[PDB]
Design a protein around this ligand. Structure first.
Ligand SMILES: O=CCc1ccccc1
Ligand SMILES: O=CCc1ccccc1
Ligand SMILES: [NH3+]CCc1ccccc1
Ligand SMILES: [Ca+2]
Ligand SMILES: [Ca+2]
Ligand SMILES: [Ca+2]
Ligand SMILES: [Ca+2]
Ligand SMILES: [Cu+2]
Ligand SMILES: [Cu+2]
Lengths: 718, 720
């Protein structure tokens, strides 16, 4: 025997004891168990299970078999997870493949000693073959291959390896490309600053008595055509510092106007920029509750005693009429693939691949410590790598299923991220309703399947939800929380002398602290295949036109419809008052309308909206990142175009992302299109967001438009 | 004696769950979460033991309970959700008795008439200051309980005021040129007049209908057209749009297009019949109740609170965490949220004195005879409070909701109790905040929102309104729309038919011979916010990109243009979601010296395309009569008599007697009592996914505290 509570909690299961019913309720992900002390059977998701050894009470402490967890949880009565006998072609590289790929490039004579790995991912099989596997069970007759991007010092080398045949296919150095920031670069920066006599001197000057309490942050320096005095060939990082005061929150203690420039290869500071000295805000501002007592709250549980409505086979998720594949990438995180909607027996294509494209958090302060601050969290730091394990019951509801995902770290060693993604179903008000006067009411509840992922890069914590509605709609929400990057200022209140100058580029949220204004810009890459590969982009602008039919009305509500045939015209601002459809000119619904999906880049948000990039068109960040200034983009499908900010955005000199992908202005008529949605916010801070910011959300939507012939949720006809 | 447990508990409205393994019943009803085992001496109510007079008895697999079981258990007191109000709140809606008292008082007047109906019998609002003194200082309102009694004498409106405290009439004032709203009996009146109309039966017959008894009519207001509609302004009229009953339970899918009868109510006769081209009635059965559908298997999902709720309902007042507010029901606009305060570490701070739906409009864009006049002001012309749709437990609201009953007066002055009129429920809404510092213990707290939901159905539309109190001080207000669309009968079956192009010029072909005529949904909310006091000022904050003048590589910087909006005229405006608009209190600042304020966001998102304004040329009468349709933000000086965006008597109104009127004198909005009005709409272009029934579509608005607090509002009580 072994202690229950002790064993079960080590297993991660939740244990509830009801003294009135003499019943134990055990819960973990998809398993919902009920067992009574002394009973010869138990219940798993509503199904009876015979027990070898009943649960026994010993001194008011329950005890169970050392084989209990296995017999009960691995019984088979929990059908949430099913075995995958035939591995899906888009499955992420396994630990063995990650290690095989690293062995292949290490065997090459060109592999240098301290080489690191910026990314080790699956090389995308051809789209057609993948769809054939998902729709026809047809085997992908092409060897699994992996892209292996290496960083040798500061040099990028792209290699391709054949995993099935275990051989190196190509090794290509990438000229003038800088590598993203890697984990070890964080320590270097701190250690380099620590051993800097000059930096220590510069710090002493600014009031810091003990330099060993100085916390550094590794920041990309961008590109300024030399105006920032930085060598374009040197792998650099700028260091903004803070003072650790023991409140567990060094972000509340900026050392303003002090910027160090570090050369990662020479391993030393190559420039110290000093501005006006500003006393360091010292007041303790912890955010972890160490100085708080939470109010008592009555318990709330969301339960599915019979198990979940979804099934997870390997990485394939099935739920209602939806079927899709969920995989992980170290750079962009979750990838939703081969998405189909089972329309009354027939699976129709919706989206081949969808995922975060890229994002950026640029600032609007010109001072020495802020002008270069423009963060590309996924591109320059790797959001998948920095995935934050979900806090069960808090980051996601209590009826959620938490998945572990595996990627490779910067040294090429497999890394398993526990609770990397959350999958959960939720009530979302009534699906539809009609209370005809004096008649029996008609209502059905709405259910949404949410896939949630949280990544934390430095001070921002980002939340992404991929929401599947029963009626065919797909939502993509992005939430932002965490700690704001603040500027140290002399003003304590708005009544102080410097208050006006101190708050020119941001709100005074605390004494001597200003939350510098900035933007949050998310871009989503959506390779939609509306009921097929070949589609077209159609615009429908609701307009007011003069009445020509006669009668009292002087005007009417009509629609201005027209096709958008090329990439340049597809790159546009989005009017939430207009309609934009990706149609399939080859298929129609029962009424003769082209089956389509309505694209809505902006469906709402809790922070002010970013209409475009808050930068003059002559700013370098603006020139480098075109995707910031347009909410909608549509390009021709290409396997190597997956990032809005380009493949190598670190200190880039020009737009290699969506600016490059659409440069050509190719035809978008009846062909394989890829939609990119850009949605952002302009963040002007307030006191309510300090020391920690309450989650703010933005919403996007993809709605079926005449894709079906009627309300998709009425159900199948008898 | 005893009675069957299931049958009885269902009748009672409780969810009954039987667990065969545990030999345990789980009973849920509002704030009561009960557990009882057959043959047990006690039951459990919200985690507390209750001794039963008669234990549950199991007989031949059937449970039986005492005829007192329901009262003993559900009214035991172990469910503390509801508490008795010891001192009646001054804003409490009129009781059944008061309603009856007010009616007896006006019937005591020598002028009262037999056919006299009541459009609205509602509490006459005490002075704002006294009510606030009661809510904050607990000072008694020594002003007499009065009630407004708006009557309809034939077609004439009469406003009377009765003194309930002294049982006496205070005033009786006729209102000239004012038309009364549509009343319940007008519906029956119209259907009856059409049935007795020899001509209409003839008009219908020639349009392919054989049995005129299967014709369903609908009462629509005619609006105002300076006479172009050839309708006498003085008469009380209504236009009739007809449908054929095919037996599928959905007559809306069987329009009799191009046939409109004008009915004169007091005259009880059809005074005009407009006829257009004959169009075959779409006949195909299109039921929406599932009679012809297969019921897909779905596993159970329950949201439970086994120890009771975190909120308390004393009388009509709701207490939840830091929030305190009063909730009442009005027959015209529905739910009214009053005296809303937020407890800031012991001190109750004012937020909103009174908030509610202002009014709404759903105007169409088709010029033809059966549509050109169609523009519904559901609350104003129909009374949404009166047409409240009882909440369907577990479907219209989550299983962990508490359902409230509300009482109003019907058109004959008789007390009316609406069951499950409003739903109150707490809900998980993701993490309140979160920060995972690398290599450190994670920090997260869950977010909880208290939702107050009301649903009203007027004809074919079903509208849902949620008042969302976030624990961090934010207040959300969402509007959801669902129901059945008003379609136009056309000849085309597909877009390939010859008439398709012309048939779809004003709407999408969503079904064979059926077009979903384009239209808008324009909601307006009257929010009398008193940000930490009555005297406030409206402030604008426009984020802007300005040239860099501080040196360095940057050519531009992100700054803010801040200015005050000193008058009502300048406050009436379009809303750019890229800017910031605040209702500040120039007399109070937070710890950093900033004016305590609330950010007003009329547009925070939606699932349908957003209505940028009224889809009408500036020379249309509806546009003229109803100016609130074109601006998303309005701010006026507080006035107890100004409560509707469309005006107090919108039925056939000739000019704007609402927000156009309330702001016509362009008064000062500097450091005075302000009233915020948010207008938010959608332009609805139909699609097949919305027929035969439309999936709920939503629009979101938001009110966020801006420097109202000194730090993250949910950090918790300071330990030192
Ligand atoms: O998120 C922005 C860049 C960054 C990375 C790591 C620590 C602090 C800041
Ligand atoms: O809801 C708007 C006007 C109406 C009322 C009753 C039936 C149909 C339409
Ligand atoms: N060749 C696939 C990678 C691999 C390596 C070792 C064991 C299993 C799988
Ligand atoms: Ca595509
Ligand atoms: Ca291209
Ligand atoms: Ca005024
Ligand atoms: Ca006010
Ligand atoms: Cu921000
Ligand atoms: Cu509509």
């Amino acid at each position: 025997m072994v202690p229950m509570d002790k064993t079960l909690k080590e297993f991660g299961a939740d244990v509830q004891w009801d003294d009135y019913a003499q019943l134990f309720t055990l819960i973990k992900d998809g398993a919902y168990v009920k067992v009574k002390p002394g009973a010869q059977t138990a219940i798993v998701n509503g199904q009876p299970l015979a027990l070898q050894v009943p649960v026994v009470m010993k001194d008011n402490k329950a005890w169970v078999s050392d084989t209990f967890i296995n017999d009960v949880f691995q019984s088979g009565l929990d059908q949430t997870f099913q075995v995958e006998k035939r591995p899906h072609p888009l499955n992420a590289l396994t630990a063995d493949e990650i290690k095989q790929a690293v062995e292949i490039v290490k065997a090459s004579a060109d592999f240098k000693p301290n080489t690191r790995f910026t990314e080790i991912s699956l090389l995308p099989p051809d789209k057609e073959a993948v769809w054939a596997f998902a729709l026809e069970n047809k085997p992908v007759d092409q060897p699994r291959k992996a892209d292996v991007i290496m960083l040798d010092g500061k040099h990028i080398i792209e290699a391709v390896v054949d995993l099935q045949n275990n051989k190196l296919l190509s090794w290509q150095p990438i000229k003038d490309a800088h590598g993203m920031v890697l984990l070890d670069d964080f320590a270097s920066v701190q250690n380099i600053i620590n051993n800097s006599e000059e930096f220590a001197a510069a710090v002493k000057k600014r009031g810091i008595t003990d330099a060993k309490k100085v916390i550094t942050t590794p920041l990309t320096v961008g590109y300024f055509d030399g105006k920032d005095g930085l060598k374009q060939d040197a792998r650099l990082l700028k260091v903004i510092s803070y003072l650790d005061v023991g409140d567990g929150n060094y972000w509340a203690h900026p050392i303003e106007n002090l910027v160090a420039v570090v050369d990662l290869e020479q391993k030393k500071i190559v420039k110290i920029e000093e501005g006006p000295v500003v006393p360091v805000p010292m007041t303790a501002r912890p955010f972890d509750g160490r100085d708080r007592v939470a109010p008592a709250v009555k318990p709330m549980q969301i339960i599915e005693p019979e198990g979940k409505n979804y099934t997870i086979t390997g990485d394939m998720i099935h739920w209602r009429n939806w079927d899709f594949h969920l995989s992980m990438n170290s750079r962009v995180g979750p990838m939703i693939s081969t998405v189909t909607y089972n329309d009354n027996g027939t699976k129709r294509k919706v989206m081949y691949e969808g995922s975060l494209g890229g994002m950026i958090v640029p600032y609007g302060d010109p001072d020495i410590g802020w002008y270069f601050k423009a963060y590309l969290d996924s591109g320059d730091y790797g959001m998948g790598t920095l995935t934050s394990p979900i806090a069960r019951g808090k980051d996601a509801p209590s009826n959620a299923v938490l998945l572990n995902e595996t990627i490779a770290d910067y040294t090429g060693v497999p890394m398993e991220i526990p609770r990397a993604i959350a999958v959960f179903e939720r009530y979302a008000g009534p699906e539809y309703k009609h209370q005809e006067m004096g008649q029996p009411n008609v209502s059905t509840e709405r259910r949404e399947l949410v896939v949630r992922w949280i990544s934390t890069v430095g001070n921002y914590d980002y939340i992404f939800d991929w929401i599947f509605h029963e009626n065919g709609t797909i939502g993509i929400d992005a939430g932002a929380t965490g700690i704001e990057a603040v500027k140290g200022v002399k003003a304590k209140t708005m009544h102080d002398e410097t208050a006006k100058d101190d708050t020119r580029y941001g709100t005074l949220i605390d004494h001597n602290i200003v939350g510098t204004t900035h933007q949050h810009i998310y871009n989503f890459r959506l390779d939609l295949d509306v009921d097929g590969e070949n589609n077209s982009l159609v615009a429908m602008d609701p307009v007011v036109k003069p009445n020509t039919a006669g009668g009292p009305r002087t005007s009417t509500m009509q629609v201005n419809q027209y096709n958008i045939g090329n990439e340049q015209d597809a790159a546009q601002k989005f009017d939430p008052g207009t309609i934009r459809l990706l149609s399939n000119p080859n298929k129609e619904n029962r009424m003769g309308n082209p089956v389509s999906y309505q694209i809505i880049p902006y469906a709402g948000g809790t922070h002010p909206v970013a209409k475009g990039a808050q930068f003059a068109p002559d700013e370098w960040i603006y020139h480098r990142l075109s995707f910031m200034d347009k909410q909608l983009w549509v390009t021709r499908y290409h396997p190597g175009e997956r990032f809005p900010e380009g493949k190598y955005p670190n200190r880039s000199t020009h737009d290699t992302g969506l600016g490059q992908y659409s440069k050509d202005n190719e035809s978008l008529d009846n062909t394989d299109a890829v939609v990119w949605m850009t949605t952002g916010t302009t963040h002007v801070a307030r006191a309510e967001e300090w020391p920690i910011m309450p989650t703010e959300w933005v919403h996007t939507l993809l709605k079926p438009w005449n894709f079906f012939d009627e309300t998709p949720t009425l159900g199948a006809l008898k």
